[PDB]
Design a protein around this nucleic acid. Structure first.
Lengths: 82, 218, 84, 120, 129, 107, 227
RNA sequence: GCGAUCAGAUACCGCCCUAGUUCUAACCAUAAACGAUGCCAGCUAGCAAUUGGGUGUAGCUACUUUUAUGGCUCUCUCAGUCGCUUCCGGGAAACCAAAGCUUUUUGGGCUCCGGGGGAAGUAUGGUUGCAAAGCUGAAACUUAAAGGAAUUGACGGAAGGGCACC
């Protein structure tokens, strides 16, 4: 949100939905982020590095939010034949 | 790689009658149902149930304080299971009558700040889900095909008609969480046998002396 | 999902369930058959939603009597569910 | 004859039980003497009533855990109490019982043969 | 029946994006609609559109990014004599920077930005922001 | 304001239905708008059943019953307390509720 | 102007005093539900100016009947990018105003400033035409060229100066005597400026790890720290 | 016209009963002619009813040696009228799956009607009518409110519980 001599003013750039490309609007407290943890290839042995997805209240209240995770996760490809 | 389905585990699911689904499908859960049986029962994709248990179980962790993950059941069939979730993984308990506002009251002594909820039945547990969405709290739930998936990120379709399904699925999350940053390590099964998470029952109750002295007779 | 497409490649099972006009390209469930009445070598291609009270080549035998969805092909008649 | 004891009596009785449960018996006379020492109750008929409602609450606590007054030894007892049922058996042969449609699913999903009968 | 077909499709698009739904079935898709829809593509407002050959009048499936607040259609197509271009852009467009007003101009169905470069005014089809 | 979504009673797609004359006022009300209650009673009423059965020859008998389906105007019904002034919430609520069973039908 | 050694019910509250957050902007990004007035008091709330718009009385019958009750209508704002507004019901004038300030701080909403198209001298205004409705009154924001300084009605002028929106035209609808609804409609208008998907916002990012998760270990533990 | 009731009853109430109800050949054109909601098209939500048709019924029953046929359920789908609960929008709310998409002073097409309350559906003229009336339909002048909503109280010869030898 740049001004005259290319410094970035206003105050913030919102977290956009990984499924709807929609703005998390700051008092939309009906909003989930899910952090699914990555696994150290072979089996279990969980090591950090979340694959993290943001989903708006609008998806959640249409009762579809579970399903958005399924497509996102398969896109990252831990889940197969969803 | 062995994180795939596990044949040994799928037999337990089969015995625990997880595949049963509420007759009336509801549009938002049509993806979770493979086939309909004759005599109005839905077959729930057992293969999807596993992968959804695993995603949910992964979701619990990288919330670094595992204690500030609040495990929830009004249903009596999950009460014993929700309590025992707390025993293995730190996960602090909300059993039965959730006192509303447990999330939205600073003044209440039931002032909980979860970074995750795991919930048994969203139809009877509507209140902590409504309350969750006032406080940006992630909600994972156990789901009938007749689930209001409203305010649920990730659904695990159990059968929730009760019996062994609520128990076995609840254990499976806790099991998976203990393989994954719990230090059980190298995902070879369980010395702790799955019937711990079940409601003890019968309401009115047989008073049977624990310490397995097989009741002969007077 | 409420972002839940893929109607360009519309999934097999669902399309089947709907209706004859509710397809992306609305295509007839109105097929073709060939009717053999065994006293006659003659095949005449008659429809299951018939549109004719169909007399075979010379013989006014019958063949089919219409009911307002699918015409009932009557009694001892054998048919190939194919454009010959 | 009539009555259940007012909030000042009952509230006092709930608060003391939470903290003091260990050192509160089914016996009234000791419950009377603990209440005056631990708590500044100005008058004797009120003190006896508070202490007496504690006696009542304690009597029901003994007769299987009483709601709302968890000392949290009670929760710790549940951990101990946890009884396992053994043998937890899939019964006869496997037990096999297939609902036919789930057998079609089983073979597809699993190379694991696992005995099925299309079963009465 | 459907006197202006244009508006019926673009309303469908609005209603769809109000669910959040990435796809719509449009009926009975005109040339004016095809040209309306190609104009959308250029500014990235919608994803890919596909016109199926029914031997009837053509239906369209829309793929939607969701970048679009709302899309409105002007009927009656008010004669713009070049200096009402300025008035029409101010009223219904949210900003002077952004949002295209859509015309039927002599040389094609074009945005007011494109129309100004060519200096060809027109009759007004639409508004997209 | 339309308090009632049904207007009076359930007229959707008919609007005008032949009226039946109310057994209490003899009025006129269309058949959708009657409060109707099914009067099921024995002819021999309560105490007398002991007395008649002994007096009457027959091995047991098993009493004939009276049926009279009475039709009420709204005005009639509420005076005789058939329908008691419900709910802005509870007018909407259908349900019933008896508890016991054996339906009232006195005077 | 506290004094208050604030003690943190919320984990969010902990972050504030430990200086691990330092910009309510982070709270807005991750959409964290500010239950504590306390949080707001530290970050901002030092140079938040509180204005009491309306003191207008209301009446209610304690049974047989007559009693009276107080309304206070409050707006709070930086001049830089913040407005929160709260209306409360109480027994007294003092309690009404204090409580209305308190409610007002919790609600604090970020304000989107854009440009004519000339990105010179820091975004003075609001970027687009953003409209919000509360009970039939809809105050409608139109972006107006510099030195128009703020064109509205006397109470919305205050509300928009609390934000620090330099220049706007506004049109407001309805029963123009019903003041409270006019204030509430503007609150919705200013709040919705983020709700427009403008073409600047179109490309997501990698977004954010949440301070809730990241600093988590510190926010569940131990002190009640001095100094 | 009668009997009670009631100051009055002229009424409710009780009796006798006229025109009228009915039918036929004509009028009239109006009603809460109401679902207070114009019509035609598309689109935007679950469930179970509900009317009708159709696709499958290796479902039950009816029968001929079983069938073939028929009805209902079960499954699936249109088009109908609605309901329930939620809006995923609107609204001032009550409510409304339409009273939604009514924009951010806009959205398919088209009609009709309202633009303070009364005077007044009257006057006036024209029209239609046998007539009664009906349509079209002012103003003078009057007046700061008027209407709808929900809220809480108060009040009932509206409804259910309790509580006390005032």
């Amino acid at each position: 949100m740049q001004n005259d001599a290319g410094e970035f003013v206003d105050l913030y750039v919102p977290r956009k939905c990984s499924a709807s490309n929609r703005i998390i609007g700051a008092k939309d407290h009906a909003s989930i982020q899910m952090n699914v943890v990555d696994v150290d290839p072979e089996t279990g042995r969980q090591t950090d590095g979340s694959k993290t997805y943001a989903i708006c209240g609008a998806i959640r209240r249409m009762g579809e939010s579970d399903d958005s995770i399924l497509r996102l996760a398969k896109a990252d490809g831990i889940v197969s034949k969803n | 790689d062995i994180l795939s389905l596990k044949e040994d585990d799928i037999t337990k699911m089969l015995v625990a009658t997880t595949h049963l689904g509420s007759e009336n499908v509801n549009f938002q859960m049509e993806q979770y149902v493979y086939k309909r049986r004759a005599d109005g029962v839905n077959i729930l994709n057992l293969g999807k149930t596993w992968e959804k248990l695993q995603l949910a179980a992964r979701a619990i962790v990288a919330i670094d304080n595992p204690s500030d993950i609040f495990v929830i059941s009004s249903r009596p069939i999950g009460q014993r299971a929700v309590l025992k979730f707390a025993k293995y993984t730190d996960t602090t308990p909300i059993a039965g009558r959730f006192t509303p506002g447990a999330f939205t009251n600073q003044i209440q002594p039931a002032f909980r700040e979860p970074r995750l909820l795991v919930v048994t039945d969203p139809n009877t547990d509507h209140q902590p889900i409504m309350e969750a969405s006032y406080v940006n709290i992630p909600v994972i739930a156990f789901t009938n095909t007749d689930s209001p998936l409203r305010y649920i990120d990730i659904a695990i379709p159990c059968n929730n008609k009760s019996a062994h399904s609520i128990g076995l699925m609840w254990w499976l999350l806790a099991r998976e969480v203990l393989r994954l940053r719990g230090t059980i390590s190298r995902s070879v099964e369980w010395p702790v046998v799955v019937d711990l998470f079940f409601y003890r029952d019968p309401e009115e109750a047989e008073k049977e002396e624990a310490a397995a002295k097989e009741l002969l007779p007077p | 999902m409420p972002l839940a497409k893929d109607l360009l490649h519309p999934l097999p099972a669902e399309e089947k369930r709907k209706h004859k006009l509710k397809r992306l390209v609305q295509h007839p469930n109105s097929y073709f058959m060939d009717v053999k009445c065994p006293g006659c070598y003659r095949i005449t291609t008659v429809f299951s939603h018939a549109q004719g009270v169909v007399v075979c080549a010379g013989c006014a035998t019958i063949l089919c009597q219409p009911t307002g969805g699918r015409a009932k092909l009557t009694e001892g008649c054998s048919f190939r569910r194919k454009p010959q | 004859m009539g009555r259940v004891r007012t909030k000042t009596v009952k509230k006092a009785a709930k608060v003391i039980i939470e903290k003091y449960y260990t050192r509160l018996t089914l016996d009234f006379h000791t419950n009377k003497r603990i209440c005056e020492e631990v708590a500044i109750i100005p008058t004797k008929p009120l003190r006896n009533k508070i202490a007496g409602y504690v006696t009542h609450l304690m009597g029901r606590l003994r007769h299987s855990q009483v709601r709302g007054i968890s000392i949290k030894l009670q929760e710790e007892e549940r951990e101990r109490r946890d009884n396992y049922v053994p043998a937890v058996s899939a019964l006869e042969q496997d037990i096999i019982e297939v609902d036919a449609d789930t057998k079609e699913m089983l073979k597809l999903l699993d190379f694991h043969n696992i005995r099925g009968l299309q079963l009465t | 029946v459907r006197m202006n077909v244009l508006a019926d499709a673009l309303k469908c698009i609005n209603n769809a994006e109000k669910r959040g739904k990435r796809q719509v079935l449009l009926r009975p898709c005109s040339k004016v609609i095809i040209k309306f829809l190609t104009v959308m593509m250029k500014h990235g407002y919608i994803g890919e559109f596909e016109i199926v050959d029914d031997h009837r009048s053509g239906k369209i499936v829309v793929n939607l990014t969701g970048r679009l607040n709302k899309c409105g259609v002007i009927s009656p197509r008010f004669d713009v004599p070049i200096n009402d271009i300025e008035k029409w852009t101010n009223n219904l467009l949210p900003s002077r920077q952004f949002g295209y007003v859509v015309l039927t101009t002599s040389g094609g169905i074009m945005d007011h930005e494109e129309a100004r470069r060519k200096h060809l005014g027109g009759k007004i089809l639409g508004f997209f922001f | 304001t339309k308090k009632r979504r049904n207007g009076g009673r359930n007229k959707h797609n008919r609007g005008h239905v032949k009226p039946v004359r109310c057994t209490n006022c003899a009025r006129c009300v269309p058949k959708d708008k009657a409060i109707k209650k099914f009067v099921i009673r024995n002819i021999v009423e309560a105490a007398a059943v002991r007395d008649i059965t002994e007096a009457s020859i027959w091995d047991s008998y098993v009493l004939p019953k009276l049926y009279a389906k009475l039709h009420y105007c709204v005005s009639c019904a509420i005076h005789s307390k058939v329908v008691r002034n419900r709910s802005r919430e509870a007018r909407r609520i259908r349900t019933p509720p008896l508890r016991s069973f054996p339906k009232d039908m006195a005077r | 102007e506290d004094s208050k050694e604030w003690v943190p019910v919320t984990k969010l509250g902990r972050l504030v005093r430990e200086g691990k957050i330092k910009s309510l902007e982070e709270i807005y990004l991750y959409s964290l539900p500010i239950k504590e007035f306390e949080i707001i008091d530290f970050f901002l709330g030092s140079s938040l100016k509180d204005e009491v718009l309306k003191i207008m009385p209301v009446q209610k019958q304690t049974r047989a009947g007559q009693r009276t009750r107080f309304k206070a209508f409050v707006a709070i704002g930086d001049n830089n990018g913040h407005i929160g507004l709260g209306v409360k019901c109480s027994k007294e004038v003092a309690t009404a105003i204090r409580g209305a300030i308190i409610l007002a701080k919790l609600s604090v909403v970020p304000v989107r400033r854009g440009y004519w198209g000339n990105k010179i001298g820091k975004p003075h205004t609001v970027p687009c035409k953003v409209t919000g409705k509360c009970g039939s009154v809809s105050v409608r924001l139109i972006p107006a060229p510099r030195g128009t300084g703020i064109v509205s009605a006397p109470v919305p002028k205050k509300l928009l100066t609390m934000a620090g929106i330099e220049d706007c035209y506004t049109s407001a609808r309805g029963s123009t005597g019903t003041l409270g609804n006019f204030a509430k409609a503007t609150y919705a208008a200013i709040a919705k400026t983020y709700a427009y998907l403008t073409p600047d916002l179109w490309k997501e990012m990698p977004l954010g790890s949440t301070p809730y998760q990241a600093y988590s270990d510190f926010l569940s533990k131990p002190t009640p720290r001095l100094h």
